[PDB]
Amino acid sequence: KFGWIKGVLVRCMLNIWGVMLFIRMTWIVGQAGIAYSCIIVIMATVVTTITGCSTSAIATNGFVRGGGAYYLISRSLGPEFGGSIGLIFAFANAVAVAMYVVGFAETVVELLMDSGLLMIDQTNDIRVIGTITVILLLGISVAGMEWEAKAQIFLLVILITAIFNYFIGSFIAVDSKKKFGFFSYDAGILAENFGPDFRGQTFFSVFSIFFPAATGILAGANISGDLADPQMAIPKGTLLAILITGLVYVGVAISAGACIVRDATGIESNFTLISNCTDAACKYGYDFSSCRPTVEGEVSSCKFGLHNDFQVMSVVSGFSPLISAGIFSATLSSALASLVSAPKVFQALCKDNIYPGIAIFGKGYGKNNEPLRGYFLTFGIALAFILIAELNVIAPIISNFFLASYALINFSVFHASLANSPGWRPSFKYYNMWASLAGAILCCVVMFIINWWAALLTNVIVLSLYIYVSYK
């Protein structure tokens, strides 16, 4: 049905561009430096590029028939790595649904607190808004699959116009947009933001919050039967969408670092508008001292800038409330693409009976065999993780499970190309199995640097599932 642009490239660019593009890129260039945000984006692009090569080698190992990213992995490689990846990835998308709707609810709550609508506290309005938007997304996943492929191009032309709106707002200079940060492209602010601050966080804890902005590269491989030719659509879409989103992340990082200060008092200075006595840097005025804390703690007695407000891409963009309100489009599109692909892999795993007490989640109800017990279990896991209503503590879990799945893929293709499996002839031009080994080692090492006990628990679960399906 689909080609390669509308089927793989648009779906990967909608699954990748999620929460951290708008509401957490500027906080990453505020915590880490520009030279560290570039290293963060280049590392999370190297990881996803190696995993994209490794899944294109699976998608070019024959097997045109059969939809689902579980099917290509369990047919090309063994059923052990297939079952392990089809459980870890179907848990990673089920918790990524919670991440994207927590980011959406946080955006809605931080829009309504600027207005008069504030019912309960900030960490309890997200638990209310995030609950309603996950039962409205469950209904649109079980009764609105025919409009999703029609509305994906509308969501993409919302999203690309939102990014271009942010950029063409970043080139202009408005003095009313000052006191929230956002002076013009200044080499003083560019030199000040060049270099880390790490207020509260650290490197490989800013990377852990970044890395779910790089996940979603298996949105092309998850639909194989929907495509026309999976030998030419899945590499050419994934390894192009990864490059496009990496360049957009690098450009957004440099644009947010080169024109926004790290802290800014939310009060206009019309008395003494030009202040240069005892000046340090970035002085068009406004006297942005006394917001940087004297103590080295996590506290910062300010309300705007790159460090505090979480939402400064609204005031940098030319028109915030509708055009830069493509935060909603990105979050709901990524949560929709992760809500119809977490039971899909799970239904494909429960049909081929592998795990004992799991085959009850395979009865696909409805007309198109949509798995309702898979949808309800994904909804249960998602609603179990919405209740921790803070994106900065959901994201080191999504990063952990997606690094586990992307280490398992890059290790399974290396083990297949090393053990010389009979049905593993990887007819792809740039595969180079030692690069997939280096990618798997890098994913495991970064997953352990982020959070060592969760990484140890996830690797013990992966080894237990592998030694179970091996000696079944």
Residues that bind its own copies (CB under 8 A): 415, 418-419, 441, 444-445, 448, 452-453, 456, 460, 467, 471-472
Q: Please indicate if the annotation marks 100 as binding a ligand.
A: yes
Closer residue to its own copies (CB): 63 or 466: 466
User: Where do we find the tokens 């030009």?
Assistant: 274
Q: Please indicate if the annotation marks 168 as binding a ligand.
A: no
Closer residue to its own copies (CB): 145 or 441: 441
Q: Please indicate if the annotation marks 447 as binding a ligand.
A: no
Closer residue to its own copies (CB): 311 or 451: 451
Q: Please indicate if the annotation marks 217 as binding a ligand.
A: yes
Q: Please indicate if the annotation marks 20 as binding a ligand.
A: yes
337 closest CA partner among 218, 256, 163? 218
Q: Where are the alpha helices (DSSP H) in 8-147?
A: 10-16, 25-31, 34-59, 69-76, 79-112, 122-143
Query: Cβ(364)–Cβ(370) under 8 Å?
Result: yes
CA dist 253 and 35 (Å) reads 10
Which whole-number Å values give the CA distances from 458 to 248, 275, 392, 452, in the listed order?
Answer: 31, 54, 20, 10
Q: Which residues pair with 370 in a beta bridge?
A: 365
Q: Please indicate if the annotation marks 213 as binding a ligand.
A: yes
**CB of residue 53 to its own copies, shortest distance in Å:** 20
CA dist 447 and 411 (Å) reads 14
Closer residue to its own copies (CB): 271 or 471: 471
Q: Please indicate if the annotation marks 212 as binding a ligand.
A: yes
The pairing of strands 364-365 and 370-371 is antiparallel
**CB of residue 447 to its own copies, shortest distance in Å:** 10
**CB of residue 453 to its own copies, shortest distance in Å:** 8
Q: For 309-375, give the DSSP string.
A: -S-THHHHSSSTTTTTTTHHHHHHHHHHHHHSSHHHHHHHHHHS--SGGGTTTT-EETTTTEEHHHH
**CB of residue 460 to its own copies, shortest distance in Å:** 7
Closer residue to its own copies (CB): 71 or 448: 448
**CB of residue 63 to its own copies, shortest distance in Å:** 23
**CB of residue 424 to its own copies, shortest distance in Å:** 12
Both tokens of 266, joined, read: 């939310």
Binding site, annotated residues for K(+):
15-16, 100, 212-213, 215
Binding site, annotated residues for Na(+):
14, 17, 330, 333-334
Binding site, annotated residues:
14-20, 89, 100, 212-213, 215-217, 330, 333-334, 402, 406
